[PDB]
């Protein structure tokens, strides 16, 4: 598609470590157009974090040009202050098809996320592969 951002809304409850669910109901999220529409269209309501990503990892704009962006918009949360006050980050989601990173910083009612390819990028030509 052709755009810069894409906000989508949905509802579910699944997203923890070790393949565990999460306390969620209905929230929205804004992802950089750098991602595919089908992503939010059939986005998996269940996340599985097995790693940890710091805010310093997403501080690299030299990687946001080849990858997509994902932001979680919520009205409530728990523990957000802890990290945001400690180092300001979150856990990373390791998918067998792709790689998503979750890091909460300077956002109590929001979360920072990154969409990376499952080690199958067609990087080669010029311009930021969209």
From Swiss-Prot:
Gene induction: Down-regulated by methyl jasmonate and by infection with an incompatible isolate of a necrotrophic fungal pathogen.
Signal peptide: none
Disruption phenotype annotation: Late-flowering phenotype when grown under long-day conditions. Increased drought tolerance and sensitivity to necrotrophic pathogens. Increased resistance to hemibiotrophic fungal pathogen F.oxysporum.
Subcellular location: Nucleus
Family named by the database record: Belongs to the Mediator complex subunit 25 family.
Role according to the record: Component of the Mediator complex, a coactivator involved in the regulated transcription of nearly all RNA polymerase II-dependent genes. Mediator functions as a bridge to convey information from gene-specific regulatory proteins to the basal RNA polymerase II transcription machinery. Mediator is recruited to promoters by direct interactions with regulatory proteins and serves as a scaffold for the assembly of a functional preinitiation complex with RNA polymerase II and the general transcription factors. Positive regulator of shade avoidance and of jasmonate signaling.
Subunit structure and binding partners: Component of the Mediator complex. Interacts with the transcription factors BBX20, RAP2-2, ERF1B, ERF091, ERF095, ERF098, ERF109, HB29, PHL1, DREB2A, ABI5 and MYC2. Interacts with the E3 ubiquitin-protein ligases MBR1 and MBR2.
Note: The affinity between DREB2A and MED25 is reduced when DREB2A is pre-bound to DNA.
Protein name, entry field: Mediator of RNA polymerase II transcription subunit 25
Organism (species): Arabidopsis thaliana
Gene from which this protein is expressed: MED25
């Amino acid at each position: 598609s052709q755009s810069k951002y894409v906000k989508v809304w949905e509802g579910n409850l699944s997203g923890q470590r070790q393949g565990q669910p999460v306390l969620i109901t209905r929230l929205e999220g804004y992802r950089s157009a750098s991602a595919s529409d089908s992503l939010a269209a059939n986005w998996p309501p269940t996340m599985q974090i097995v790693r940890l990503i710091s805010q310093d990892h997403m501080n690299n704009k030299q990687y946001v040009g080849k990858a997509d962006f994902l932001v979680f918009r919520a009205m409530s949360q728990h523990g957000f202050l802890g990290q945001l006050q400690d180092k300001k980050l979150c856990a990373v989601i390791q998918l067998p098809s792709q790689t998503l990173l979750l890091s909460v910083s300077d956002k109590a009612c929001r979360l920072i996320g990154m969409l990376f390819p499952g080690d199958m990028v067609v990087f080669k030509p010029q311009i930021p592969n969209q």
